[PDB]
Design a protein around this ligand. Structure first.
Ligand SMILES: Cc1cc2nc3c(=O)[nH]c(=O)nc-3n(C[C@H](O)[C@H](O)[C@H](O)COP(=O)(O)O)c2cc1C
Ligand SMILES: Cc1cc2nc3c(=O)[nH]c(=O)nc-3n(C[C@H](O)[C@H](O)[C@H](O)COP(=O)(O)O)c2cc1C
Lengths: 109, 105
């Protein structure tokens, strides 16, 4: 099951919703992450160029997909196949962002 | 400001999230709508053909826009410029649906 998050469109994109699979993948309960920017999933081995691409895409409200190294609440690394899309109304205003997270790590084999 | 709703993909698409503007437009609070199908916004003069077009697009996970007559909690009719999009993972599975509601009355 893939994680899904909704964030606000404005002012550093606080989380406003996560699905159950997001908790399964990340180790965080919904109420521990509401109101926060998703960058808390990053850590020292996260690729800075990837993060830069995300930063520029979100600022421009452009869809973006990346495979990014993230970290569970407990510190356990996982590779995140991440897809972010703006949600627009019919006059083009960005209402929110949606993010999908798939854990693509081979954890056990 | 436009309303936004997120539903689950299966099991008759219950609401799992609404934004502030959804409540401004519709008169329902989040707690009144979570877990329900969005069709509670329809009423007596809602166009049946429009509803069927939405039904088919959701079943096929196809994006669709309709101008549909809906009803505020207090029963007042309003024209809903509605856009629905599937949310997919990178292998194509539908994870959720997103709806965007503009009151264009
Ligand atoms: C909807 C949404 C979901 C996001 N999900 C993730 C994620 O799962 N993992 C991640 O490392 N960053 C994720 N981000 C990106 C970070 O929140 C942040 O935008 C990125 O690190 C670039 O900003 P920064 O350089 O200011 O940290 C997400 C962003 C948005 C808008
Ligand atoms: C994300 C999402 C948002 C929806 N928003 C609305 C809405 O604002 N108004 C509406 O009349 N129907 C809306 N619908 C459509 C109804 O939920 C339902 O799918 C439609 O009436 C056709 O199905 P039915 O014949 O089973 O009722 C939405 C559906 C989804 C999946």
């Amino acid at each position: 099951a893939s994680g899904m998050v909704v964030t606000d469109a404005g002012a550093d994109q606080p989380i406003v919703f996560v699905n159950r699979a997001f908790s399964t993948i990340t180790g965080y309960a919904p109420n521990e992450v509401l109101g926060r920017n998703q960058r808390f999933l990053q850590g020292p081995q996260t690729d800075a160029a990837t993060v830069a691409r995300l930063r520029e895409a979100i600022a421009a409200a452009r869809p973006i997909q990346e495979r990014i190294l993230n970290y569970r609440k407990d510190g356990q690394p996982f590779w995140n196949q991440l897809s972010i899309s703006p949600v627009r109304d019919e006059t083009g205003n960005v209402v929110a962002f949606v993010g999908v997270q798939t854990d693509v790590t081979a954890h056990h084999h």
